[PDB]
Every structure is written in C-alpha cells, then in structure tokens.
Design a protein around this ligand. Structure first.
Ligand SMILES: Nc1ncnc2c1ncn2[C@@H]1O[C@H](COP(=O)(O)OP(=O)(O)OP(O)(O)=S)[C@@H](O)[C@H]1O
Ligand SMILES: Nc1ncnc2c1ncn2[C@@H]1O[C@H](COP(=O)(O)OP(=O)(O)OP(O)(O)=S)[C@@H](O)[C@H]1O
Ligand SMILES: Nc1ncnc2c1ncn2[C@@H]1O[C@H](COP(=O)(O)OP(=O)(O)OP(O)(O)=S)[C@@H](O)[C@H]1O
Ligand SMILES: [Mg+2]
Ligand SMILES: [Mg+2]
Ligand SMILES: [Mg+2]
Lengths: 267, 494, 438, 118
C-alpha cells in the first residue's frame, strides 16, 4: 500500500508478509498477529528493522519475561500506554490515572476506555501497536491467559480515534497449536541452515573483531603488514570459518553458542 | 512513612454502624412504644421507588402494529383464581390466621419441585390476609420478603430484616444481636406481628446451619410474634441439617406440593385463554392491526386437541406449568410468523393454530442435534471418528491412545489404495497438492479437527505434555457415532 | 497509477469486512439465521417484548458478526429506544460482572440523555431495584459471550437473576447468549433451566462446494465503479470461477475436503492481493495461484517433520540411538547412559565395518542432549504440560517435583517420534539409514 | 519459586534505597529499569546465596537466566557470590550448559576454610 519494505538477509518472505499485514490504516489491519520461531531464529531483529524503516508507525515494546505474572503485565500495559500517548501528543490536556489501580482484567478495560476517551479531538483515526515480545516466556503460565488477550479487542470502544492492535512473538509449537481454531494470521520463522549461520556470523562479528586491542598489540610487537584492512578481514573470516567447521557438529545451528566460542578462542 | 508490602487501592466500604440495639434505650422499662415511631415498621418511607424510576423512559410510539396473535402471546406469559391449589391454600391460610389472631409465633415449611406454584399461592395467601386485616378483623401486621438467590453474601439476610423493621443500617453481626434482643425482651404491648417469607432456603444453609437455626428458633420465644414461612425443594432438609431432637422441639407445620397432572395443566391453559378464544376481531388489510370487538371481521380459534396433547406431553415428563405455557406461546409465535410471512406484513377467514404447530414446537425441545452436526462435518473429522470407532471395536477399552489413532489412520489410507476417491485424495491429504512439501507425519489439518471435535463437547482428552500417549474418549455413547458414520457414502463403502 | 492502489485498497477492505453497513454483503448459505435473529431483535426493540435466546456453534462461525451487523443496522433508525450491554465470560468473574453491568448501564444512560458507588451488595441491590422492580420504556439488550463459564456446577446466581428479570419485569429485556458446546441445556440447574425460554438456534454449516464458490465470488467481486480497472478485474475472476480446472477451484476444493472454513482461505488470500505491485502481476497471480503453495509450505515449516530436516549429524545419530533404546524397553522409558552406550556401539560397528567417524565424548554429548530436549523431541517420564486454569498452576508451582532432584544421568525420558517414522522420513542416501530398523 | 525470590529481592532493594535516601511501585525487574529516574544514582547490586547445596538448581538456573535480562540498562552492575560447601563439580554437573558458559566469562575461585594449612 504505502509502506516501505526493508532488506533483510535471509528473511525475504517474512518481511513481505509483515509489510502486507501491519500498516497505518486501522480499516485494513488484523487485530492480532503471531510470529513463531525457536531460539535464535531472527524475529525481534526483523520486527525492529521493519519498525525502524517506517517512522510513521507507532509502537510500544514490552518484554513479559521480566514481569513474571499477569497483574504486573496489566499494570505495565496501563502505564506504558499512558506514557507513549503523552509523549506523542503534548498539546492535549489530560489527567493521570494510577497504574496500580489495575488489579483485574475488567479494570484494565475500564482504565483503557477512560484513557482513550480524552483523545477524541484528533483529526483521523490512528492505530497504536502493542508488541508483547515473548508471551510464551511467562514463568507461571496456564492455558487461559491468551483467551483473554484475544477477546480484549471487543469490549473497547468501536468508534474511538485511538485503536490498539496486539503483536505476539511465540516460541513453542505445542502451545500455539492449542489455539489453532481461532484462525489468527501467523508468520513462522524456520530455523537456519549452516551456510546462512556462517554468513550471518561473519557479517556480524567481522568488523568488531579487528578493532580489538590484542591484535593491535600483536602487530605493533611485529613488523609491517601492507594491505592492512583486506588482510585483517581475510584473517577474521578464516578464523570464523575454521571455528564453524570445527564445532558445528557440537553447537548445532545455534548462533549464541558459536558467538560465545568465538570470543572464548580469540585471545 | 512506611513501605507497604502490597496495596489494596480498590476497597469500598458502606456506612453502617456497629452498636447493637440492646444499648440504645437503656433499661428495658425505658423502651417507648415502637408502633408510633415514624421510623419503625416502615411508617413513613415511600420514596425509594421514585429515586430510580423515570430513568428508563422515552417519548415516542410510531403506531406499533398489533397483529391478532400478539394478544394471545401477551396473555400467555408467566406474569399475567387458583384452579387446582385449594387444599394447600386453605391449610396455610388457616395456620397463619390462627397465628395472627391469638398473637403467637409459628413456622410453616413448604417443600416441592420447580414450577408447581408454591410462591404464587403463598403470595395470594398474604394478599388475602392483608385485605382481611385492612377490613379491621385482625390486628395489622408487616410483610417482609427475603430471597436466597438475590443476595451476594449469604449472611445479608439479617441486616435486611432489621432494615425493614427499624430503619437503621447496621452490619450483619450487630443486626443478629439486635434482632435477638428485639424478639426476646421487647414486651408484647409495644410490637407488631411480622410475616417473613424466607425463600430458596437451600441456598442459605450451605456452610453452616446458623441462619436456619436462628430463624426457626426465634419462633419459640413467648414475647416474639413471628410467623415464618419457608419454601424449599427437598422435603426432609431440616432433618439433614439441624437434627431430629431440635426439629422435634421446634415443632413446625409441614406441607408437600406434588406435581401437576394432564387435567389440571389443561385447565390452567384453558383458564388463561377465556375471552380471546372463539372471539371476533376487526383487522385492517393494509397494515394488519387488530382490534377486539377497508376492514375485515375474523375469528381466532385454538384446537382443544393441541392443548390436550401439549398438556399430556408436558405433565408426563416433569409436571411444570411454565414449560407448558412456553410451548403454547411458541406454537402461537410460529403461527404468527407464518401468517405475517404469507401476507407480507411487517413491524411498525378463520385464523387458527393446528396440532401441527404445537407438534413442531414440542419436537424442538426433545430432539438432539448431534447426528445432524456430524452428518455435515469435514472428511478428516469423519476419518478421525471412524478410526476411533475401529480401535474401540478391537480393544474394547473405551479410552484410546492418540498414536494408535494416527497409526490406524495411516493403515486405513495405505490399505485401501485402489478406490478412486481415496486414490486421488492421498496427495491432498499428505502433501497438500504441491511437489515442494515433504511427506507429512500426521495429516493435513490434524490439530484443527482435533480441537474442533474437542470444543463442541464430543471428545474428552486428559492433560499430558507427551502428545503420543495422551488418552481420548467419546462422550456421546457409541450408537450415535455409528449412525453418523453409516449415513456417509465413501466411509460406508470402504 | 492511483487507480490500481484504489482497487487494491478496496479489495483489502472488502476482505477484512470493514465496509459501510449499508453496502455489506452476507453469504447466501446463512441468510435464514440472519432473518431469524433480525426478527427476534425487531420484536424485542420495536414492539417492546422480552426475549431470551442462546446461539451454539463452532469457533469462527459468524456469531458475533451477525449480531454486530444487526445492531449496526438497527442503530440508524431507532437509536433513542434501546441500550446495549456486552459481557464476556473470559474476562468477567462472578463478582466483576456486577461492577461491569453497573458501569455500562451508567455510561449508556448518561449518553442517551449514582449507581456504581458503594459496596458490592449496594450496587447489586441498586441494579435490582432499577431493573427487576405517548411514553414507552427503553429496552436493555444483553449480549453474553461464552455463557458456559457462568453455568458452572456451584452457584449459577447471575443467570437466575437475569432470567427472572426477563420473566417478571416491567422493563423489556432481551438477552443473547453465545457458546460452542452442543449440550448447553444440561449445564443449567433445575430452576435456571425452568426459567429459560427453551429457545436455541444452531448456526448453519457448509454442505456443498457451490456454497464455497459463491462465498468466494461474493468476497472478491467489486460492485462499485471506483477505478478504471474494475471493469476488467470483475471479468477476469469470472473466467477463473467458471472453469472447473483452474487452480483457484482446486485450492477451494482442497480447503473444502480438509479445513472447510472461509476464514482460513481469507487469511491465505490476503497477502496474495496485498503483495502484488502492478495490475498485470495481480492478474497473473490470480491466474496461477503460485503464492498459495508458498504460504502452505511455510505454514508447515515448524511441525514435527519440519525440524527433523535441520539437525546436524551428531544430533541425528543421538536421536536414532535414543529411539532404538526406547523401542526395546517395556514402557518406552530410557535415559542418557543407555543412549550413549548404544551410540558408542553403533559408532564402533560403523568404524569396524569400513573415513573414520569421530566418537564424541560424554561431556560434548551432554550439550546435544540438552539441545534435543529443548526442541521438544523428548519429554519427562510422566509430566503434565500446562494446567487448565490459574489455580491449578499456582498449586503446582509450590511443589518440588522429584524429577528436579535426581541427577542428570538418571532422569527417565520418553520418546515422541517412533523408529518407524524415522525410517519413513530419513532419505536412503544417509549413512545412518541402515541403523533405523532392528 | 522464581517470582517469590524476585519479589523478595526487589522489596529489599527498594527498602534499602528508601532508607539511604532519608509513593508505591511494583516489585518487578522494571524497578531496576526506572531506578535512575526515581533516585538519581546507579545500582551496584550484590547478591549473596547462602547454602547453595540445598537449593533445587532448576530454580537457581531460571533466576540466573532472568537476571541476565538486566544487562541492557547501562547503569547497573550485578555481582554474585556462591557459598559452595562440597565442590564445584556438582555445580558443573547440575546446572545447564549455556548458564555455565555465561558464568565462565569472568570468575574468581577463593578457598576459604578454617583449616587452610592449620
Ligand atoms: N537475518 C539476519 N541478518 C543478519 N543478522 C541476523 C539475522 N538474523 C539474526 N541476525 C543476528 O543474529 C542475532 C540473533 O538474535 P535475534 O535474531 O534477535 O534472536 P531472536 O530470534 O530474537 O531470539 P529469541 O527468540 O528472542 S531467544 C541478531 O541480533 C543479529 O545480530
Ligand atoms: N394454579 C395455577 N394457576 C395459574 N398459574 C399457575 C398455577 N400454578 C402455577 N402457575 C404458573 O406458575 C408460574 C411460576 O410461578 P411458581 O410456580 O410460583 O414458581 P415457583 O413454584 O416458585 O418455582 P421455583 O421457584 O422454581 S420452586 C406462575 O407465573 C404461573 O403462571
Ligand atoms: N465486527 C466485525 N466486522 C467484520 N468482520 C468481523 C467482525 N467481527 C468478526 N469478523 C470476522 O467474521 C468472521 C467470523 O466472525 P467471528 O465473530 O470471529 O465468529 P464467532 O463465531 O463469533 O467467533 P467466536 O466469537 O470465537 S465463538 C471472522 O473472519 C472474523 O474476523
Ligand atoms: Mg527476541
Ligand atoms: Mg419462587
Ligand atoms: Mg464472539
């Protein structure tokens, strides 16, 4: 429509679907959206790049792993919504509602309605994106919390100028298959190959490795090295390739384990 | 200040006092006449209704059309002369009149099954007693009605009673001592008889027998003038709660309300339709408005056979009256819908209702909608049910493992690989029709059909995180599933 | 050209259904339910008559959609004669329901032209006095969602009061319940069921393929001249829904035989029309439908067989060894030591049969074991997963299971993929293939 | 549990900060995020586990993983002390592997006993 697609290395179709689903028009956008993928698959990176490519879209970021229950999650939502709405429009007079008053799901709906009532002097309807990045990582989780956040979008006002849309990022498949009857749009992030992991690892930890002080000390203790930059990058790439070819059978397709081994065996 | 370990920021507390009644008028000899006080016994408080009324009012009526059947539907609700209940009326009235006349206390217990009409006859008795008292034959009294399902906390009865006899607003405990003192020590020359109507009694005694014991015991005192009437479902409920000796000491009256028969129910239905049946109506052709006695003159008739069959069917199973009234109303509604549909009317000869309408309205409550639900399910769900039935026909265990179902489905698919339909459905079932998808392990749309069957109330699955040994079982018996499978064609053939 | 953008936006907002209520389209296979619901609501609102009814049907069967359509249709001719109150059974307990009802009643009554202040009992008695008790009244329309959670086996006190309000009152009331259970009538207790009106309407279901074809045609047909291309596109679709050999018909038939649900097809179609950049691209995409294959392939990219093709050699060998060990056991249980013993025996046999394959040590196989148990290939001996409700999880979180006290080497796991499935899936060119059967 | 340990730690931190400083908040990791705005200085939190041999290591591993999330705030500095009684071989064999790799970034082992050389 009127959105810009960023360029991600090996996530073309995911980026296309993301640009297809979410936009700035509340008339054409889904109320819910799930991104699924196991650890180290590249979902938060893609989502952050997509929002950084389009500055018009508004977003609020949460991480329901520091918060370890549902009451703190409700309070955090009720506080961050107010903070983001205040920092964006500063010329609209408003009162303040204490987030700690939110103790039940119904009270969250009441507080959100009261907050959204004030901003009724705006020109055209907008949409505010609430990203619950990590919904499956709550410590005390049961099979009933998601059923509330799915239906939370029906008790809110229907003709308000501020519309809220949710976006989840879920890890497992056994949990996700429980809610397969709801028919919610989904974008799945499959795991990586070995070539893709090698290229991503080089692209990430190639430039940063060379400004390390150890190699500078080792070359000032040594003689001249002409064609310095290209030779240095080649040395780094060769080291990364060697460590990958050595420990792929032990680390699997895990970016984090290889990224720790590289730092371990560099000095 | 201090740091709170947790906070309660949504606490709401009502303004109610704590001091009981036996601290107000000092000595017993200093108690004034409670009949003449302007706050006691509701002498002057008649403005609570006006506080909240007139809010749900508006000013518009666009000549609402009233079809012929609208009168019958209106005059057949459960709100609009007792034909059958006379012995119970006489017994209750005699007991209450004897209790009121001699200035004493008594307890009447009524037990029955839903829909008999115990509340209606008790209210009629109360109305007759009020009329007789207003006729200046017995001393005046007060009527207080307390329900059991219309209270948030079960201990809200006490204060309510006090709030209806004194005008004060106290907590429940202080209300208990206040009522105890009032019923025990206030002299009989400065009181007035009270008729409580404890209703749905089984919803109050669910943690302890305190409320029932107190309410029944307050009738034992000589100075009290209480007449308690308590209705309930089970007959021998106090015995199961209080004890044989306490009940023997109390000594109340017992009444049982038996169900209705197919004659009394028909009498009720016929009585509720007397003026309307076999009458004449002026009907405007353009709109459809009907007026009880250009335009036409029509009649409304209800066949007695329909009423008889409805009463016979309803009285056979339950004995209710609400259900019979609702069945007749639904038949009338169906006839009205057909009439307006045929004549092309809208909202804003001899028209009758046949036995066909009543039978159609009656069949809607007895039939079940499971066979029809399964005869329209997807192919995969029917395959799942077929595999489950096949496994049950071999193991005979009634509780099957899920991996066994998967293996049975795979074997069924791979053993019949010569029938045209299953020959051409294999690719769409295992690879979804494309050559770039690897062969799947379970089926296309496994979790979807599993959850679709589990949500509707057809399967029961225990909770285990291992998804290969989870046990599932049916919940609609076995013959219905067999019929649903047999109604198919491709599953029947193979 | 802006015409293509306008056409694309119109198609997207037609698919999502966000469209003015006077030009919405309703499928031909569920018009009878629409007419029945419309008759009930019109009788309740225009003619001031009380009603109670329950709607039963599977998830995403157009229950809320029809009610919202009816309310929006009636909220433009008679707006001063009714108010609406909606309750949801998932975010409303047996206590917060009273507060929600009071708040919504107050807000709607204020808007048309206190109650919510006090304790719970005061609010309950105030709303009871308000409801239970030319110039005409105002109808309050209740809309329940998931009514089966308010009909438990313990109290059932709100439904009793609401049905009593419907039965004996002077204020007309209409109440709609929504649930998915097929035997909702057996959840109500005796008195509540007696007060019920015994009126249940079952949502319709798709019976043929022509119904799905007609639904798709109604979805993807622009019927208002807004762009120069609307003349051609409306033609092109008609050439793909009439030909019985087109790819669109094949996909529709597959959905009919497997899923049988419009929302899934709608979700599949959305990116297909939102991705194309030019009119020719849209035409060729709807002619070939090659994007639906990619969508289907992705939707199956993390299932049980989609992970097995992203494993290294050592992980595959460990998985095969564990499956072999679990096959011989009586109840399928095993642990780390037996799996490693079988792995080392298999490696020694492979090496002796014949470059040499390295035999990784115990401490290096520990990481692979943890990686495999993370990816949901094994589960503990007898462990439940996620509890049904919050109280069960709270109870379970305060008890120390015996599985977290036994050392690492003796935890008893269970298998999730049997050996036959490994034999079916793994290609025959792999050097571990011969070891996948006993 | 994990949530209860988090609540105790946050309550102790807030009480100590308020005592040193001479409304109400939520006892979550979010209090770590907003510490600079609420007070003005930077944290140097020091944990101290006592009798680590009597703690079910699943909970301890989960808590360490949770505490890992506080490294993106630029003003906190977390330290850990383990009072091991027998030996660190049990610690190595009981914890997960990723957490051991995380702990091995920098550490110091000190032998503290009454009978060290008599
Ligand atoms: N497509 C990609 N192109 C370039 N770098 C990438 C790509 N995907 C991942 N990376 C890099 O690898 C890192 C992996 O971290 P993330 O992708 O953020 O992990 P994640 O999927 O968010 O993990 P979880 O789910 O939160 S545990 C990124 O921060 C990048 O540095
Ligand atoms: N003899 C009768 N004559 C007319 N209507 C009757 C008669 N008996 C019962 N009814 C009907 O029964 C309806 C229900 O009221 P009741 O029968 O008094 O209820 P109930 O016995 O209190 O039921 P519960 O509360 O479930 S035990 C009334 O509104 C009447 O229409
Ligand atoms: N207000 C609305 N306007 C347009 N389409 C809607 C609206 N509400 C829902 N839909 C869509 O209509 C289809 C089915 O309606 P739903 O309300 O989801 O069905 P349902 O049977 O009520 O589902 P429940 O609530 O889970 S039982 C889906 O595609 C919904 O996204
Ligand atoms: Mg992430
Ligand atoms: Mg009654
Ligand atoms: Mg709904």
């Amino acid at each position: 429509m009127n959105v810009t697609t960023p360029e991600v290395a090996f996530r073309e179709y995911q980026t296309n679907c993301l640009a297809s689903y979410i936009s700035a028009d509340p008339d054409i956008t889904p109320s819910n959206l799930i991104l699924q993928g196991y650890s180290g698959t590249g979902k938060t990176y893609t989502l952050k790049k997509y929002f950084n490519a389009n500055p018009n879209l508004h977003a609020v970021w949460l991480e329901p792993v520091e918060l370890v229950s549902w009451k703190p999650l409700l309070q955090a939502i009720a506080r961050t919504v107010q903070y983001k709405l205040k920092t964006l429009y500063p010329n609209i007079p408003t009162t303040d509602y204490d987030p700690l008053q939110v103790e039940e799901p119904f009270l969250l709906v009441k507080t959100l309605h009261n907050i959204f009532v004030q901003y009724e002097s705006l020109q055209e309807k907008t949409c505010l994106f609430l990203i619950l990045d990590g919904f499956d990582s709550l410590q005390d989780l049961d099979a009933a919390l998601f059923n509330k956040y799915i239906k939370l979008n029906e008790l809110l006002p229907k003709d308000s100028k501020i519309n809220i849309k949710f976006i989840y990022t879920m890890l497992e498949t056994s949990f996700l298959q429980r809610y397969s009857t709801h028919c919610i749009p989904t974008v799945m992030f499959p795991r990586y190959n070995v070539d893709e992991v090698s290229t991503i690892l080089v692209m990430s930890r190639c430039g940063e490795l060379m400004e390390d002080s150890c190699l500078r000390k080792r070359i000032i203790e040594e003689q001249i090295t002409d064609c310095t930059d290209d030779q240095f990058q080649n040395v780094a790439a060769n080291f990364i390739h060697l460590i990958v070819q050595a420990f792929h059978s032990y680390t699997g397709n895990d970016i984090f384990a290889l990224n720790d081994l590289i730092d371990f065996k560099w000095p | 200040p201090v740091i709170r370990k947790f906070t309660k920021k949504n606490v709401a507390r009502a303004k109610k006092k704590y001091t009981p009644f036996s601290k107000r008028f000092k000595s017993i000899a200093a108690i004034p006449d409670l009949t003449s006080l302007p706050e006691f016994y509701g002498n002057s408080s008649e403005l609570m209704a006006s506080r909240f009324e007139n809010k749900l009012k508006t000013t518009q009526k666009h000549q609402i059309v009233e079809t012929i059947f609208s009168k019958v539907k209106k005059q057949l609700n459960s709100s609009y002369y007792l034909p059958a209940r006379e012995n119970e009326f006489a017994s209750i009235y005699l007991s209450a009149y004897s209790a009121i006349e001699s200035d004493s206390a008594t307890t009447i217990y009524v037990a029955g099954t839903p829909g008999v009409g115990k509340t209606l006859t008790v209210r009629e008795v109360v109305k007759e007693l009020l009329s007789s008292s207003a006729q200046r034959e017995i001393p005046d009294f007060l009527y207080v009605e307390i329900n059991g399902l219309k209270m948030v906390k079960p201990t809200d009865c006490y204060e309510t009673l006090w709030n209806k006899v004194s005008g004060e607003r106290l907590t429940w405990a202080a209300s208990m001592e206040s009522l105890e003192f009032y019923f025990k020590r206030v002299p009989k020359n400065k009181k007035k008889t009270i008729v409580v109507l404890l209703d749905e009694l089984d919803a109050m005694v669910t943690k302890s027998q305190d409320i029932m014991y107190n309410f029944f015991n307050w009738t034992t005192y000589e100075n009290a003038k209480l007449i308690v009437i308590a209705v309930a479902n089970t007959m021998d409920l106090p015995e199961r709660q209080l004890g044989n000796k306490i009940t023997s000491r109390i000594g109340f009256t017992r009444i049982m309300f038996t169900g209705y028969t197919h004659e009394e129910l028909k009498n009720i239905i016929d009585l509720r339709l007397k003026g309307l049946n076999d009458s004449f109506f002026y009907v405007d052709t353009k709109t459809g408005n009907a007026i009880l006695i250009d335009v036409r003159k029509v009649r409304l008739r209800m066949s007695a056979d329909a009423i008889e069959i409805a009463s016979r069917k309803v009285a056979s199973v339950s004995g209710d009256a609400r259900r019979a009234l609702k069945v007749c109303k639904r038949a009338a509604e169906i006839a009205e819908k057909h009439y307006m549909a045929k004549h092309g009317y809208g909202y804003d000869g001899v028209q009758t209702v046949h036995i066909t309408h009543v039978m159609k309205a009656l069949n809607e409550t007895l039939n079940s909608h499971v066979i029809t639900f399964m005869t329209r399910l997807s192919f995969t769900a029917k395959l799942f049910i077929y595999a489950l039935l096949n496994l049950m026909k071999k193991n005979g265990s009634q509780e099957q493992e899920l991996g066994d179902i998967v293996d049975e489905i795979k074997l069924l698919i791979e053993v019949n690989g010569s029938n045209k339909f299953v020959m051409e459905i294999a690719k769409t079932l295992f690879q979804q029709g494309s050559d770039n998808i690897s062969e799947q392990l379970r089926i296309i749309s496994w979790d979807f059909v599993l959850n679709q069957l589990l949500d509707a109330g057809i399967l029961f699955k225990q909770t285990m995180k291992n998804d290969r040994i989870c046990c599932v079982k049916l919940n609609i018996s076995v013959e219905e599933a067999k019929r649903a499978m047999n109604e198919d064609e491709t599953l029947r053939n193979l | 050209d802006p015409g293509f953008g306008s056409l694309q936006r119109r198609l997207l907002q037609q698919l999502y259904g966000t469209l003015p209520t006077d030009e919405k389209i309703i499928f031909t296979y569920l018009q009878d339910c629409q007419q029945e619901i419309d008759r009930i609501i019109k009788q309740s609102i225009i003619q001031k008559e009380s009603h109670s009814v329950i709607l039963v049907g599977p998830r995403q069967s157009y229950k809320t959609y029809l009610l919202d359509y009816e309310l929006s249709l009636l909220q433009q001719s008679y707006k001063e004669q009714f108010i609406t109150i909606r309750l949801n059974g998932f975010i409303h307990s047996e206590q917060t329901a009273i507060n929600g009802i009071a708040t919504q009643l107050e807000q709607q009554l204020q808007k048309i032209h206190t109650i919510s202040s006090g304790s719970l009992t005061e609010v309950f008695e105030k709303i009871l006095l308000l409801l239970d008790s030319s110039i005409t009244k105002i109808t309050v329309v209740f809309i329940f969602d998931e009514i089966d959670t308010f009909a438990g086996p313990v109290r059932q006190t709100l439904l009793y009061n609401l049905f009593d309000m419907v039965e004996h009152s002077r204020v007309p009331v209409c109440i709609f319940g929504c649930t998915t259970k097929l035997n909702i009538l057996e959840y109500l207790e005796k008195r509540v069921k007696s007060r019920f009106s015994q009126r249940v309407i079952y949502m319709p279901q798709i019976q043929n393929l022509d119904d799905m074809v007609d639904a798709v045609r109604n979805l993807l047909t622009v019927r208002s001249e807004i762009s120069p291309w609307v003349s051609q596109w409306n033609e092109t679709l008609e050439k793909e829904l009439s030909d019985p050999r087109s790819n669109l018909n094949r996909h529709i038939r597959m959905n009919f035989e497997t899923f049988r649900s419009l929302p899934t097809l709608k979700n599949s179609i959305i990116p297909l029309v939102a991705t194309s950049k030019n009119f020719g691209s849209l035409c060729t995409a709807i002619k070939s439908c090659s994007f639906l294959d990619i969508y289907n392939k992705n939707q199956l990219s993390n299932n049980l067989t989609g992970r097995l093709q992203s494993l290294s050699d050592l992980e595959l060998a460990i998985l095969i060894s564990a499956a072999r060990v679990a096959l011989r056991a009586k109840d399928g249980s095993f642990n780390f030591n037996l799996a490693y013993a079988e792995y080392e025996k298999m490696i020694k046999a492979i090496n002796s049969r014949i470059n040499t394959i390295k035999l990784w040590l115990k401490k290096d196989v520990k990481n692979v074991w943890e990686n495999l148990v993370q990816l949901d290939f094994f589960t503990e001996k007898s462990a439940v997963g996620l509890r049904d409700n919050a109280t069960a999880a709270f109870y379970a979180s305060n008890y120390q299971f015996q599985g977290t006290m036994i050392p690492f080497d003796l935890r008893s796991y269970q298998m999730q993929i049997i050996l036959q499935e490994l034999r079916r899936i793994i290609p025959k060119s792999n050097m571990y293939y011969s070891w996948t059967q006993l | 549990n994990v949530r209860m340990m988090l609540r105790r730690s946050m309550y102790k931190l807030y009480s100590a900060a308020d005592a040193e400083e001479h409304n109400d908040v939520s006892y979550d990791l979010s209090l770590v995020e907003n510490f600079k705005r609420l007070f003005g200085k930077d944290l140097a939190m020091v944990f101290n586990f006592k009798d680590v041999d009597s703690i079910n290591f699943n909970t301890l591993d989960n808590f360490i993983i949770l505490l890992k999330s506080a490294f993106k705030y630029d003003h906190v500095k977390i330290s850990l002390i383990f009072n091991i009684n027998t030996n660190l071989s049990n610690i190595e064999k009981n914890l997960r592997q990723s957490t051991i790799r995380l702990l091995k970034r920098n550490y110091h082992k000190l032998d503290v006993s009454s009978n060290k050389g008599f």
